């Protein structure tokens, strides 16, 4: 998708996790965010369009998504083992990282 | 120390990093924060007296600290590399993580 869509596919699924009751809706939400995060990584946001392709602020921007995928992978581990309450909490650690990338590049 | 002076140790050094002038000063404050958070990790918050230390709550409280120390370590790396601007930037990103644990356990 485009960055704007991935962000929405990221946004809704965070709520799916928290209003999921079983580990199996948790796991499929995360699978989706992972793909949506890795797709948004390819993008070049508004307030860096008029800037380099090997920008340092551009590699920092793409490393935001690697860090997010890492958290997503971790919560999947908590999920796949059926540790349901743990994996919803792990997912909630994404929030700060969502916000931090906004504050700089949104 | 007790958890209240640990959180004070994290509280003051955040402003110490806010004021700081060179990489040495930022590193020393991040060093104290790391030890103040790893020690506070072993403590039990008043909101959690009547849990058992293997409860989800006390796991989420410990994990909360594991995430902070990882990001304190990221900020230590930037500071050792002489990037005082970014290490400071990475430190006040810590604050959302503090609040995220404060909104359950403070
Ligand atoms: C960078 C590494 C980011 C991370 C991690 C997250 N987001 Fe984001 N987000 C980013 C940008 C640059 C933008 C603005 C894009 C634009 O051109 O407008 C956004 C935007 C959003 C939005 C609004 C979508 C819109 O069209 O304005 C939402 C709802 C959103 N982001 C949610 C969101 C969540 C929940 C995240 C973490 C789980 C998250 N984003 C991470 C850059 C980055
Ligand atoms: C859990 C995973 C926590 C993280 C991460 C941080 N804090 Fe903390 N904080 C936590 C608890 C359980 C409490 C209650 C202390 C009490 O006994 O009531 C607090 C509170 C504080 C305080 C108040 C100290 C006081 O004497 O009342 C401060 C000043 C504070 N926290 C600072 C702080 C900072 C700056 C943090 C990250 C950078 C941080 N805390 C993380 C639990 C957790
Ligand atoms: Co993190």
């Amino acid at each position: 998708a485009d960055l704007e869509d991935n962000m929405e596919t990221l946004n809704d699924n965070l709520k799916v996790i928290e209003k999921a009751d079983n580990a199996a809706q948790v796991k499929d939400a995360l699978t989706k965010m992972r793909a949506a995060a890795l797709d948004a990584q390819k993008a070049t946001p508004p307030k860096l369009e008029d800037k380099s392709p090997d920008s340092p602020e551009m590699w920092h921007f793409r490393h935001g998504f690697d860090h997010l995928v890492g958290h997503i992978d971790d919560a999947l581990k908590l999920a796949n083992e059926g540790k349901v309450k743990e994996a919803q909490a792990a997912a909630e650690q994404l929030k700060c990282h969502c916000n931090a990338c906004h504050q700089h590049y949104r």
Side-chain angles (χ1 to χ4, degrees), chain A:
Chain A
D2 43 89
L3 187 86
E4 313 73 69
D5 273 319
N6 292 158
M7 287 316 153
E8 246 296 275
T9 67
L10 270 188
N11 194 78
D12 310 302
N13 266 291
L14 242 185
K15 285 153 183 258
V16 179
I17 294 149
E18 174 236 4
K19 306 320 284 190
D21 302 78
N22 62 330
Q25 302 162 9
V26 169
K27 188 251 279 141
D28 191 36
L30 303 173
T31 311
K32 175 49 160 331
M33 309 184 75
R34 209 194 176 279
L38 278 186
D39 197 14
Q41 195 170 44
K42 293 112 156 187
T44 309
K47 295 319 268 296
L48 290 173
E49 217 146 279
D50 312 272
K51 190 112 62 148
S52 312
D54 256 12
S55 311
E57 38 268 33
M58 263 290 137
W59 288 109
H60 185 259
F61 168 86
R62 301 165 250 220
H63 297 160
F65 289 110
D66 295 314
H67 194 70
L68 212 62
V69 157
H71 277 278
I72 289 156
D73 283 342
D74 283 21
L76 274 144
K77 200 113 187 307
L78 301 190
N80 288 345
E81 300 78 52
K83 288 162 188 152
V84 188
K85 63 285 188 196
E86 288 76 8
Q88 286 176 294
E92 240 195 86
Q93 252 166 23
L94 296 157
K95 297 215 263 239
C96 284
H97 295 320
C98 314
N99 297 329
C101 183
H102 296 159
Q103 175 54 42
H104 275 292
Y105 299 118
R106 179 166 168 174

